[PDB]
Amino acid sequence: NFIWKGFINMPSVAKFVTKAYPVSGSPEYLTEDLPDSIQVGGRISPQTVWDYVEKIKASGTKEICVVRFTPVTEEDQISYTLLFAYFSSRKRYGVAANNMKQVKDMYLIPLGATDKIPHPLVPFDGPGLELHRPNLLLGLIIRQKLKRQ
C-alpha cells in the first residue's frame, strides 16, 4: 500500500502529485498527519546538517519516518525530475514550509547514485530501499513503534 498520496509544490519550478511508500517506519495509517499539498519553503545544507537527525536519536532501534516519493503520472515525473535536478545540482535538501501538525520539520532528500548511502538514515528497521533504484526524492519525517493494528 501507499501510505500517502498528495502534491509536492516548489512554486513555478516543480509542482506534481506523488505517492509516499515507507523506507524506515512501520506502515499502518499516517495519511491523517499529512496535508494534500506540500509547499517547499527553501533549502538546507544536507552534507553537514545531518546533525539534527543525530540529535533526535536517543535509543537503540529509534526511527524517524523516511518515505520515498513515486510520481503517479508521466506529467508528474517531469516536475519530479526538475525538483530532483534542482537540489541534486546545488547539493542541498528541500524543506517544507506548511503548518506541521505533529511533524516539527520535514525534508526532501534528492538520492541519486551514492557509493556510501547517507549514513545517518541507513538503519531502517522495517522496510527499506532496493539496490537498483532510479533518481529518488525521499520525505524525511517521524515514526515510532513498528507493527500497528
From Swiss-Prot:
Source organism superkingdom: Eukaryota
Free-text tissue specificity from the UniProt record: Ubiquitous. Expression is significantly reduced or lost in glioblastomas, glioblastoma cell lines, anaplastic astrocytomas, and astrocytomas.
Name the record gives this protein: PHD finger protein 3
Organism of origin: Homo sapiens
Shown segment, full-protein numbering: 1206 to 1354 of 2039
